């Protein structure tokens, strides 16, 4: 087509979606990771994660307001990945990289799994 | 912080949100623009438009599944802006610029209003 494109649009959209999350506006699901609860927007979760895409395209699961993750999932790892979904920024540290990578494999977030593998390889 | 950032994340999120819209997945509102109907995600509309942000933060309107726009709004102008919300690309043409600018003013989409004003000024 002959469209023009606003470079910062996608980043500005994501910033606004994170502001809605902050303010608990139109959040429609609670993700439970053992004793912790995280409120989010199903569409943002599906857009970032192959696991959430599969869950919320299921004709029964699409209607659930609570999703319980596998008990082996680390709440801090999930929190770091949820923040990445809404900001593009990943708080990857020596102390959390193993939990973050395991969580990203489970959630099916291939680009995160990729940077974790690279950071681990560099320390070996 | 000491975060790393994935450059293409925001664009990839928006591309996936547009794929959900295409496939009518988890759309939760119908926008009516006279005889036409457009299905969308409230969160994407709020993230792009000051008018939708005000509508869906209202304690009563947040629960509506149908929103009727002012009868003066042009359906093609709205369609072009809805596509821009989900793609960052604006199909601005000599034949639609007046309707697009009027619709963007109504929807409170300041960057679109800005490029329309500039394109109009260049033709004068």
């Amino acid at each position: 087509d002959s469209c023009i494109q606003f470079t910062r649009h996608a980043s500005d959209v994501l910033l606004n979606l994170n502001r809605l999350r902050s303010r608990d506006i139109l959040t429609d699901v609670v993700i439970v990771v053992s004793r912790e609860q995280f409120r989010a927007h199903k569409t943002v979760l599906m857009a970032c994660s192959g696991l959430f895409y599969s869950i919320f395209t299921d004709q029964l699961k699409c209607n659930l307001s609570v999703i319980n993750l596998d008990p082996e999932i680390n709440p801090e790892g999930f929190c770091i990945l949820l923040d990445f979904m809404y900001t593009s920024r990943l708080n990857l540290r020596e102390g959390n990289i193993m939990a973050v990578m395991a969580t990203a494999m489970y959630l099916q977030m291939e680009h995160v799994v990729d940077t974790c593998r690279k950071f681990i390889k560099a320390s070996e | 912080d000491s975060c790393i950032q994935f450059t293409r994340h925001a664009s990839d999120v928006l591309l996936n949100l547009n794929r959900l819209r295409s496939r009518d997945i988890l759309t939760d509102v119908v926008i009516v623009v006279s005889r036409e109907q457009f299905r969308a995600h409230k969160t994407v509309l709020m993230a792009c438009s000051g008018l939708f942000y005000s509508i869906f933060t209202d304690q009563l309107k947040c629960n509506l599944s149908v929103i009727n726009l002012d009868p003066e709004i042009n359906p093609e102008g709205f369609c072009i802006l809805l596509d821009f919300m989900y793609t960052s690309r604006l199909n601005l043409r000599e034949g639609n610029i007046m309707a697009v600018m009027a619709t963007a003013m109504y929807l409170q989409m300041e960057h679109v209003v800005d490029t329309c004003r500039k394109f109009i000024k260049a033709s004068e």
Partner: peptide, 4 residues
């Protein structure tokens, strides 16, 4: 704004 750019030409994509």
């Amino acid at each position: 704004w750019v030409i994509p």
